[PDB]
């Protein structure tokens, strides 16, 4: 028992982690195969980001220009070339580390582990949500840009985030690992401000499984709702709408639990309605939404990779 | 920017968690050097577990009797011995992947990061702090036993928990990796119950500066106070003692931003006799206590591994 935020373990990619500087830029690539991707903006000085030609500084740049490094090891670079907003550095070397993977995006509402890097060295773990405004609230200062973020099954690391950007807010913003930016942000200093956040109810739903999984069972009124019905209260509070792909994704929680998902739905509305009343649920005076209906199984069943 | 409950990169453990089974029994075991050390109630059935006598029961089983898995490979146990509440399996193969590393006792209100695994498979990482009873709030299932928490510095990894017990309340008990429990505890299903936590008071100062540094500011009143007057209002509220080791412990956070600690004593005064008001402090709407101010330190200077 017990119920905590919870990050894949990080080794697999911690062996792909480099160290990539042009110029007086440093940021983290990562090592796959015989390639390195890191964020175009590495050839950018501060004041390139006010406004990057990318194309144009990156023709006067040779592979000569970029170091990478391995730990206390130089990779040869043999060959460069843009993709969207990343670059691929080909090296001479393989990375005898690299794990089975795949590049992935995701979509708004999923998590994933970051690793977050500095100079090429891995220096924390965490987990975070994509937001629905395609933001992620993360941990990042600078020489963070690089760092990933990833899911694990098994043997297999999913890459899905490689972050480039912090917004004047302090959320965070970043790329797939072809480069392209989750939401409408892009890689130059400018005027871009994150819409307004909504809140994963699919999410709480989850967490308040959970919850009854580890016995914190007060918040359960006797009352049902219709799906419309949960749907108008939770629109008023700025909670997303909840959809039947996502009642049906909540069928083994409820499965394990006897609680139908729209008798938890009827459970929110009155904690929307009437707050918590100064209690906590899974030692939180909130209720939280970066925990999918897949982390509350992994970590009720144990997953393993 | 942003401040996350962040964990240690764990891949340097994860390459020293094994599977030992004795008869009907799997737990995790940790392998470095010939050595894999894990809890000794991997020779107890279930029935065993009410009134054990470990000597008894060990003098029964050969080295043949444990079955050590790194993977999908057998290691041969060549020894064995109990050392407290520990086994020591001597193999004939030392671990290839065995990092710098130390065995440590931590203090109360110390953090480590836990590396949660299953039939010897690494499953999820997350941060936690050994509470003032010497209980740690994990996310532990059956079969977890023999997961280790650590902290890292560069290079070396200092190994400071082994899990063993959950206690009637959810809460879980271990060892440091001599086999000595922490607290009053003992592997054996009797009647012991954690003694009455309390809050660790230097660990909520340390996250208030977390949170000035961050922006996150609205709780930073007028006043000042003394070291006595605070600590007759934290008694009242189940805090901990503030000693004077530990407003020097506070003083580099204090200079990064120019509030001394005895004003953010203050602060935190008021919070705990007029509460929040339903207003959030680092995306809370409750006290942390879980990080140090080594941890704080780290994660907004970006120390690396």
């Given at each position: 028992?017990?119920?905590?935020?919870?990050?894949?373990?990080?080794?697999?990619?911690?062996?792909?982690?480099?160290?990539?500087?042009?110029?007086?830029?440093?940021?983290?690539?990562?090592?796959?195969?015989?390639?390195?991707?890191?964020?175009?903006?590495?050839?950018?000085?501060?004041?390139?980001?006010?406004?990057?030609?990318?194309?144009?500084?990156?023709i006067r740049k040779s592979n000569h220009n970029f170091l990478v490094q391995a730990g206390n090891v130089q990779l040869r670079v043999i060959g460069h070339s843009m993709q969207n907003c990343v670059l691929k550095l080909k090296v001479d070397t393989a990375n005898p580390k690299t794990p089975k993977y795949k590049f992935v995006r995701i979509?708004?509402?999923?998590?994933?582990?970051?690793?977050?890097?500095?100079?090429?060295?891995?220096?924390?773990?965490?987990?975070?949500?994509?937001?629905?405004?395609?933001?992620?609230?993360?941990?990042?200062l600078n020489g963070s840009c690089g760092s990933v973020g990833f899911n694990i099954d098994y043997d297999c690391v999913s890459f899905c985030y490689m972050h480039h950007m912090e917004l004047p807010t302090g959320v965070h913003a970043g790329t797939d690992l072809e480069g392209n930016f989750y939401g409408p942000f892009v890689d130059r200093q400018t005027a871009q401000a994150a819409g307004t956040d909504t809140t994963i109810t699919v999410n709480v739903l989850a967490w308040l499984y959970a919850a009854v999984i580890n016995g914190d069972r007060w918040f359960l009124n006797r009352f049902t709702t219709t799906l419309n019905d949960?749907?108008?209260?939770?629109?008023?509070?700025?909670?997303?709408?909840?959809t039947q792909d996502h009642v049906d994704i909540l069928g083994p929680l409820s499965a394990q639990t006897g609680?139908?998902?729209?008798?938890?739905?009827?459970?929110?509305?009155?904690?929307?309605?009437?707050?918590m009343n100064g209690r906590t649920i899974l030692g939180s005076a909130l209720l939280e939404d970066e925990f999918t209906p897949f982390d509350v199984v992994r970590q009720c069943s144990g997953v393993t990779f």
């Open positions: 028992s017990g119920f905590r935020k919870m990050a894949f373990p990080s080794g697999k990619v911690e062996g792909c982690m480099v160290q990539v500087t042009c110029g007086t830029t440093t940021l983290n690539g990562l090592w796959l195969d015989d390639v390195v991707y890191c964020p175009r903006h590495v050839i950018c000085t501060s004041e390139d980001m006010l406004n990057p030609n990318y194309e144009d500084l990156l979509q708004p509402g999923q998590t994933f582990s970051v690793l977050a890097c500095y100079n090429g060295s891995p220096s924390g773990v965490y987990q975070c949500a994509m937001r629905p405004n395609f933001t992620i609230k993360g941990s990042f949960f749907n108008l209260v939770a629109m008023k509070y700025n909670y997303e709408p909840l609680i139908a998902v729209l008798d938890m739905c009827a459970s929110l509305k009155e904690l929307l309605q009437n707050g």
